[model samples]
Target: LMSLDTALNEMLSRVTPLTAQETLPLVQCFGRILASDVVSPLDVPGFDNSAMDGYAVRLADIASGQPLPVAGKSFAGQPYHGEWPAGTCIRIMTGAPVPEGCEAVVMQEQTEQMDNGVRFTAEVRSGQNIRRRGEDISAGAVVFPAGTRLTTAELPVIASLGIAEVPVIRKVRVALFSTGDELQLPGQPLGDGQIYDTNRLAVHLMLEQLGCEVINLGIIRDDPHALRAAFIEADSQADVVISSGGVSVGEADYTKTILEELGEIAFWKLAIKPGKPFAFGKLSNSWFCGLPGNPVSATLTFYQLVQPLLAKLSGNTASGLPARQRVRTASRLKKTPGRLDFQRGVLQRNADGELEVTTTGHQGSHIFSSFSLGNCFIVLERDRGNVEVGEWVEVEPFNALFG
Candidate 1:
């Protein structure tokens, strides 16, 4: 048996980040890790332009209560090209470039148009409505650093820089399976001692949300030959092999014995409530993870442990939560010492506008509905006892896995 902290740290220390890279078009790269830094190709506006739909005039060419004849008009994609006298102004719309000598722009709302010229009713200051070049972005600036995950927010920014293609770390290839003779497929009639398989489906769905390339091997029975064939096949085709139910050995189960022969297995009983049985080690060509038999334990262990491993393998620098938050509890929480507890709970702001959390009734290992009813995990310390109402507790909210 091992403490959760010790097991997690050791597992993380054994693996290094993958360096494989692939280039993809910007339109097809959402949720991919950026493998290279992107520098801006040009200035944002690319030129000096107007910010108002009015007249452009040099400050020295304007006098109080005097009308200046319009030299010409400048619209977007169209520049005024005309001779300007001593006292003259150019009619410029928003996003139009100001004339070379022009220093300020006055909106038409503050000016009155006369038969031969335009008159300003209010005083206009120099450089009031001119948008200078490179105001938002400069040419050759590093806008996005490497290790960023491409998203809706990032793709548009890269498009603005005229980057059609982007380099990204390749997705992690994961092979997964389940073991049990009693497990039966969903929607099928169950024989005596047979049960519906849940872990395979849950884990498969989560891997998709994590952006992994999943090679699902389905369910393997307790037969030694069958389990051996599945493990060998999974190890050959995936960077990571994940299995649920068979971290522990039973009279009918041959998982632990075959693991010892085919690979080194560090089977651990974790110091965490609702989950304990876990196995992690290296096969001939892939890393391995063995989850607990229960549906809740399998999902929780995968989220807390496998998620980080996948992040490291896929070169995703930012894959976890921002941070745990402390809030008051609105319901009583049951717990026993010596095991860390992750109780499902609903977090919300109360009538007083302060953050508080309430339990989702029962927290048994078989109650998968707790995940659907709660938004976060109320993380209780390994040595902490039962929790009372209004007591402070640490909470970690669900991420894209539960979204």
Candidate 2:
């Protein structure tokens, strides 16, 4: 069995970022990777404006506790276009463009309204409460660098620049499937020795959240002819084909045999618990990831291994593997030396605000409920032994998928 790190590095070495790009409407570009740097066309707020509902005044003109004659009113989208008169101030609302020659804005609460003018109780400083032009963004500035995954925060900035459409990398198409004649779909009556397929649904959602277009091939019975046809079709139609079972050394499984005939099969096993029987290779134009049949194993392997591979293949240069943080264990953890163990755990902050993690019950590959109760995986290194309470261990918290 190959080491997890070595296996992942090998898989990444074979992948090349997709160069195809497409133009999409701004509203539809959320969660897509930016193909090129976006330069701002115009300055944000183009002009000096008020940040508060107050009077825009020349700081030098304000005398101590003295009233100044009101010139005119200025609201957002409607500015006082007249020339500024000396010893006068304009009543400005929030976001209103400050009149020319106005140096400061004194809060309305600091002033008293009189019959003829307004009197200030405090001194006003120059440039106070005034938003300068290009303070947030400048024209011709590079706002978003290439490889940035656009989200809700990015959409507004793009729209603020009057950009209606954006250029983004084309979505990665993933062909997904499950194998074994003993597997049945959910809501169907299960026969003897049969179990409902959970990996396909979980993997499908995982792929979708990663911004992939999934072509579900459904369950292929344990037959050589069916397996051959599925792989050929998937390779022709998709950039990647992911199957959940039939990678293990089983007499009934035909995936490995068919894959070897059609394309080359890379490494099959890894020195990792719950996901040792994982496979990755290429078939013509399509990449293949053969995940284990166990529910927790499939999910963990997908997050730990496949996520980064997909990111690389999607042309996301800024994306990398998920980050791990060190946390103190609240309970004892059992582990062996030969393989890395990813034990499901719940992480919480104690009263002292220190991160503490507790393992979910039963660290078994087939126990789906354990993973459901977990928010992170207590990552035990390959050579680490039993961990006691209060010991520090690295944990990878689930992001977007189980969170």
Candidate 3:
């Protein structure tokens, strides 16, 4: 057994990025890690352009209600190629490349157009609404460095930079499994000592949220031979294998024996409540994680340890749950020392301008009612336990991780 911080440090040090490379088309690159730094091939916008729809003219032409003769039309994606005569204005729309000699733009709202001319009301200033060449990004500039997880909003930047194909980190392929004779998939008639399997589904979706390609190996009983065969099948295709349940001290727990016989078990116990009997190691080509049977414990181990390891394997530079400001405890919390505890909590802003947190009614690892209603995890360090109202505590923001 070891402290959460100690186990985490050791786990992070052992995980390494894969050397394999893959490329996805630009459209599919969203949320994928870029394997290489991407530099702009050409200037953004490609030229000096207008940012407003109105009259394009010299700044000095602003005199009280003076009417300027319209000489030519310039719409977005189209430009008047000829020069504008002196004292004449060009009718321009947003995104139109600025004319050769024009120096300013008067917004359409401030201008009135007649059949023959245009009238300006507000004072027009030089370069009032012009988007200069290379304003957003210059040629050869780096758009995004390596190790970037692309966001949907980043698509526009790549498109504007004119990149068609992109290099991306190969997706982490993970083999997933669950054990125990009591396990039954949802919708089956309940047999004695059997329960529907929501833990596997939860773990799978959580892994998906971390951006891994999951290969489900299905449920297996506690029989060692059957479990070993499934483990061997997963070792061939997955970079990592995650198993929930059957890692404890019971005589029927075959997960520990199989690992000792056919694989290497790195660390077997974590000094954290709700997830103490966790294991990590490798079997030939695949890394292995053995989680406890308790549903909350499995989820906690996945978030606290396995997820971070997976992030490193995916070439992520930094990994941790999303965090918020230290909030005051709204209710007293109780726990024993010697292990860190992450109690599911609901974080809310009180009327007095303070972030206050309250724990759910149940604190058991298998309880989902509290976990579902909470938006944060109230964190208590390994050496500390009891908490009082008004005490400041660290919190993990709920939706921030999957966002």
Candidate 4:
């Protein structure tokens, strides 16, 4: 069996980045990956502006207890166009353009207002409270590089530059489904010995959060003809095909057989807890990812393995995988040596303000309630055994998909 990291790295090695791109409006570009570098055509802030509501004056013209005439007033949208007379001041509001010949600004509280002028009491410094033009970003500079994923914070910057549309990579199309006659839909009546098909629904939400366009093929039975038909349709329709269940050694699991007949596939039994049976392959035009049937197993395998592969295919290099942090375990954990255990855990800050993690009860792959209560995975190394309380362990936090 391949190690967890080695299996993931080996699978990602064969990925080919998607080449299609599209132009989208700034409003629609959020969460999309940039396909080309975006250069700034204009400077941020555009001009020097006041950072506060104050009186603008030259430092050389201010003296303690000396009264200076208030020449004019400057508002945010309105600017004082006339020249600033010497030994005079202008009342300026926040974001108001700093008029020419003005060297500094003093807060309104620092000056005493009189009938015809304002008296300065505070010591003045040059260029204080004045925002210089292009201080944040300069024109002709690359503001966003290729493969940069756009977020809500980036939208304002792009819009401020007056850019109406941006070039972004096309969303990857993923055809997904589940296999097994024992699984039924959620709302439908359940058979005596069957369970609801929860894996496909959970996997669908996972793919959606990853920004893929999902083509749900519903549920395919254990029949050979049905499995073969689904693969053919999925291969011709999407960039990737994902199926949960039927990849194991059971007699009814014909997914692997059909995959071998239709295209080249590799069945892997990884050295990972909860999720061990994983398969990767390629069809006529689509890549394939086979996940185990257990709900918790499917979720873990997707987060630890398939998520990174999908990101690579979407042309996003910055988003590789979920982040892991070293944190102290709050309680003792039990484990063996051969497989890496991904125990569901809840992370919290203790009274000492230190990060502590505790395992959710029952680490079985069939127990999905534990995953629901978990915000992170308490990862145990393949060669490590039982852990003592307060021991440091690596944790992979759950992403937006879980919440």
TM-scores for all candidates: the values are: 0.84, 0.85, 0.81, 0.87
Better structure of 1 and 3 per TM-score: 1
Task: Quote the positional error of residue 299 for candidate 2 in Å.
Answer: 1.8
Error of 4 at 233 (Å): 0.8
lDDT (Cα, 0-100) at 12 in candidate 3: 74
Model 2 residue-pair collision total: 0
Tens-digit lDDT string for candidate 4 (1-403): 6898898888889998897999999888877899999899998778999999989998777953468889998898999878778778999999999888888989998889998789998888889999988888899989999888899878788888889899999999999988787888877898877889888888899889889999999898778898899988988999999986655422234555777788788878889997788888888999999888878888888888888899899888785467889999997989889999999899999999999899887788767897789988898999899989899899988888887
| By TM-score: ranked, best first | 4, 2, 1, 3
Kindly indicate the candidate among 3 and 4 with the higher lDDT.
4
Name model 3 segments beyond 4 Å from true: 50-81, 85-95, 102-130, 162-164, 186-194, 248-254, 318-320, 352-354, 400-403
Better of 1 and 4 by TM-score: 4
Model 2 ranges off by over 4 Å: 51-73, 91-94, 103-129, 185-193, 248-254, 351-354
Cand. 2 TM to true fold? 0.85
Candidate 1: list runs displaced more than 4 Å. Answer: 1-6, 50-95, 102-130, 249-253, 319-323
Model 1, residue pairs in steric clash: none
**What is the clash count of model 1?**
0
The clash number for model 3 is 0
lDDT of 2 by residue, 69-104 (tens): 788989988998887788788999989999888899
Kindly indicate the candidate among 3 and 4 with the higher TM-score. Answer: 4
Q: What is the lDDT of residue 155 in candidate 2?
A: 80
